[PDB]
Design a protein around this ligand. Structure first.
Ligand SMILES: Cc1c2c(c(O)c3c(O)cccc13)C(=O)[C@]1(O)C(=O)C(C(N)=O)=C(O)[C@@H](N(C)C)[C@@H]1C2
Ligand SMILES: Cc1c2c(c(O)c3c(O)cccc13)C(=O)[C@]1(O)C(=O)C(C(N)=O)=C(O)[C@@H](N(C)C)[C@@H]1C2
Ligand SMILES: [Cl-]
Ligand SMILES: [Cl-]
Ligand SMILES: [Cl-]
Ligand SMILES: [Cl-]
Ligand SMILES: [Cl-]
Ligand SMILES: [Cl-]
Ligand SMILES: [Mg+2]
Ligand SMILES: [Mg+2]
Lengths: 203, 203
């Protein structure tokens, strides 16, 4: 079928959604596209290049809150951004795994620059703004990964529980992870705020 | 060589450290142990079972701060716990990936029960204590994953940067991730504290 970037990525995303990140091999991608491997190699040199581009396209397709609204507070922006990031990562199987370790793509420069600039405009040093942004990303990535990967293990295989753990597992099995995610997100945001407002005060 | 649980795990950990989580196949494990695949299958039925046990053994070997000291504050415990968790996950290549999605093992029941009990004793509901513990784990897992996975991509492949992003990348390349990790950890902890102390107050 068609082998422009867009179609190669479409097909890769589809494949990722079926077989997960393990199953995203160049041989399997070639199979899905209906082509021979040297044909694919002309367009896609290895798994790594594919993963970088998938990371970018996942956000381009489904990350709709990349930018602060007019007059939006930094707290509100971080909140909306994190929820959108989460939604995008959950869209595809192992999407958070795909996103891991990446750096902003040229196509993401203006977006991430605006994010960073906006933090500094709200009183953060570049460093402290970056630390807050990173912590939000890491927390969100960790939550999504444990949610997605837990689900992959339940279909892989299936008491003596002490009571608090028994109940803690009941709490976790009664929700997809969103409740605990949103709770931790508020904690994290308020903590940045305490830090930011403290200035040079011991806090 | 010897095929008790301990030796199988030793060898798997070694293999993981060399080839990462992709390279941890039962065929390669058999090769390292010097055995045929049906021999290995008797001891290890699939990759999933191997991963669960590796998650457990990584913490057993290198997670030394699983339990609160006598009279230790919950804040201090969470801090020390998170640092220890991080250190354990960084010990092996893709260790954080190995740990993802798991649930406490029977061998971890008493430990995690004590953690949960200790939070409740310090004023948290079981739910809120769990939410704090989870957020710490997720944040820590996310940070380690992006640190480890970033490093794997630098050896996989190698300007037009706007200034804030340029500098943000300089900041990130000048440290292994620990500084930003420890900064986010304090934010997260203080946020739990604001939540906890607020009780029924609007906060
Ligand atoms: C500022 C920044 C960000 C990210 C990032 O990886 C990064 C980096 O690797 C080095 C220096 C700065 C950054 C994000 O991944 C990203 O997910 C992202 O690309 C991004 C985006 N493209 O919209 C975001 O929404 C941000 N958000 C999840 C906090 C975050 C912003
Ligand atoms: C309480 C709890 C924990 C963990 C966990 O996975 C979990 C769960 O899946 C369901 C319900 C409760 C828990 C941890 O993974 C673990 O990493 C862990 O096993 C653990 C340990 N074994 O010592 C920890 O140190 C904890 N810490 C990283 C916050 C955390 C505690
Ligand atoms: Cl074409
Ligand atoms: Cl295209
Ligand atoms: Cl606002
Ligand atoms: Cl033996
Ligand atoms: Cl043994
Ligand atoms: Cl203390
Ligand atoms: Mg990133
Ligand atoms: Mg866990």
């Amino acid at each position: 079928s068609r082998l422009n970037r867009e179609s190669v990525i479409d097909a890769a995303l589809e494949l990722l959604n079926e077989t997960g990140i393990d199953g995203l091999t160049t041989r399997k991608l070639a199979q899905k596209l209906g082509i021979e491997q040297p044909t694919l190699y002309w367009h896609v040199k290895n798994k790594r290049a594919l993963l970088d581009a998938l990371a970018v396209e996942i956000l381009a397709r489904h990350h709709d809150y990349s930018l602060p609204a007019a007059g939006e507070s930094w707290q509100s922006f971080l909140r909306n951004n994190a929820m959108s990031f989460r939604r995008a990562l959950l869209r595809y199987r192992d999407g958070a795994k795909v996103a891991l370790g990446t750096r902003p793509d040229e196509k993401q420069y203006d977006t991430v620059e605006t994010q960073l600039r906006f933090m500094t405009e709200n009183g953060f040093s570049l460093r402290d703004g970056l630390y807050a942004i990173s912590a939000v990303s890491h927390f969100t990535l960790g939550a999504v990964l444990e949610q997605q990967e837990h689900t992959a293990a339940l279909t892989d295989r299936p008491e003596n529980l002490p009571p608090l753990l028994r109940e803690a597992l009941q709490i976790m099995d009664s929700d997809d992870g969103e409740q605990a995610f949103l709770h931790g997100l508020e904690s994290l945001i308020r903590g940045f705020e305490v830090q930011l407002t403290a200035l040079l005060q011991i806090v």
